[PDB]
Amino acid sequence: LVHVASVEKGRSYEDFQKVYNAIALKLREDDEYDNYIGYGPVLVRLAWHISGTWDKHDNTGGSYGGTYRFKKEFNDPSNAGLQNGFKFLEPIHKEFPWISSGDLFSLGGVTAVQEMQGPKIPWRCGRVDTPEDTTPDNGRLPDADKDAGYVRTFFQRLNMNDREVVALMGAHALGKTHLKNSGYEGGGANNVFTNEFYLNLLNEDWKLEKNDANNEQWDSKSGYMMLPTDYSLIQDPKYLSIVKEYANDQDKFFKDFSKAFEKLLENGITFPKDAPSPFIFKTLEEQGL
Ligand code: HEM
Ligand SMILES: Nc1ncc(C2CC2)[nH]1
The missing domain is CATH 1.10.520.10 (Peroxidase; domain 1)
Incomplete structure (x- = not known):
């Protein structure tokens, strides 16, 4: 086709x-x-x-x-x-x-x-x-309640590799979840594009909680949230290395995100x-x- x-x-x-x-x-x-x-x-x-x-x-x-x-x-x-x-x-x-x-x-x-x-x-x-x-x-x-293996396999269908997946997910620095849309709540509510998704993953104190829709999500005391699929990027050692790279190099994240x-x-x-x-x-x- x-x-x-x-x-x-x-x-x-x-x-x-x-x-x-x-x-x-x-x-x-x-x-x-x-x-x-x-x-x-x-x-x-x-x-x-x-x-x-x-x-x-x-x-x-x-x-x-x-x-x-x-x-x-x-x-x-x-x-x-x-x-x-x-x-x-x-x-x-x-x-x-x-x-x-x-x-x-x-x-x-x-x-x-x-x-x-x-x-x-x-x-x-x-x-x-x-x-x-x-x-x-x-x-x-994709589903949000899954693990790193799910994310990796899912994105193969879109011809994306680990770096591409981790770069694309940096878009989760933007906006927020809405309980009525997705069964998740919270987010930074930011409208400025930065590498803060990665900094938040690495630097916040994350707790696995249930939200009002009875779904699990990771919450920080600072008020941020991560979906299980987001958090999987620091549970998987290959994804983790790339998260660290983008947390430490704004320009590299921008260039890789743009390509992906x-x-x-x-x-x-x-x-x-x-x-x-x-x-x-x-x-x-x-x-x-
Ligand atoms: C495993 C992959 C992904 C999952 C499970 C996922 C899941 C979700 C969920 C559940 C929401 C909340 C929707 C709502 O309640 O309004 C959301 C929001 C969002 N997603 Fe993702 N997403 C993934 C990948 C991506 C990618 C690749 C991008 C773009 C490159 C992206 C961009 C966004 C943006 C910008 C928002 C905020 C929307 C808003 O503020 O209204 N997501 N995502
Ligand atoms: N960190 C994070 N994961 C998902 C979000 C909101 C949908 C944008 N923020």
Whole structure:
């Protein structure tokens, strides 16, 4: 099964920078969302969930087809809460109806990371909407109540190795869990992209507690939390080494996250030899906007 990137007709870097800017401007404007966290973290989560359905074995799922717009995927229990991100992007799509859904969802994640002072994430256009019957079934996104072996095996389906997994999980520095969405509660409620996930893992005093949904999670007296799958990154000795590396090198984390996140968002897509090079968008701050 082959998905060939097809550039939206006649569009170039400047068109996509305009879409980026519209997303970024709305991120700045709609600041009250989720007790003043803003929409950044949920947009990152959305970009990950639309990509994380991919299966390397048959090239089903993935960001290309924009299938999150269809009920089956929209209503995946694993996607509870992401409707907020979709609603945020609706007026963007209305203004720029020419962008494909997969391009919009993935660009939303890139824009959020960058606007939250994260690394630059190169981004490529050309995802093409595919029909409702191409929507992957529910159950391809990961469970949070599992151990390191589960995480490692799960991510093999996405063609991610240990370093890539540990780098991607650093996104859990952003936002928070919500009991009604996932059965977990708490989080740093941060909207600035840093390597603090790793510092928190290594430096906090963690206690295994049950939350009000009767699920186990690790809590610190400082008020942070970790999912069992997060905590597994310090229980497994291979993951632990990488956690220590990223806790001790902000730049290395940024560079590795950028590569892994672009890869995640591009899995399943064949880029023609003459496709445009990846775009690196300027932030609003860099543009003086
Ligand atoms: C084993 C892998 C993973 C598991 C089990 C997992 C699980 C979860 C859960 C349960 C939540 C809370 C949802 C809610 O209650 O609203 C969450 C939130 C979040 N996840 Fe993950 N996740 C994983 C990997 C990732 C990856 C790879 C990324 C991105 C690179 C990511 C980005 C986020 C973000 C940004 C949030 C916060 C969303 C918000 O504040 O609304 N996650 N994750
Ligand atoms: N450390 C940590 N694990 C999960 C979270 C929240 C969902 C963002 N924070």
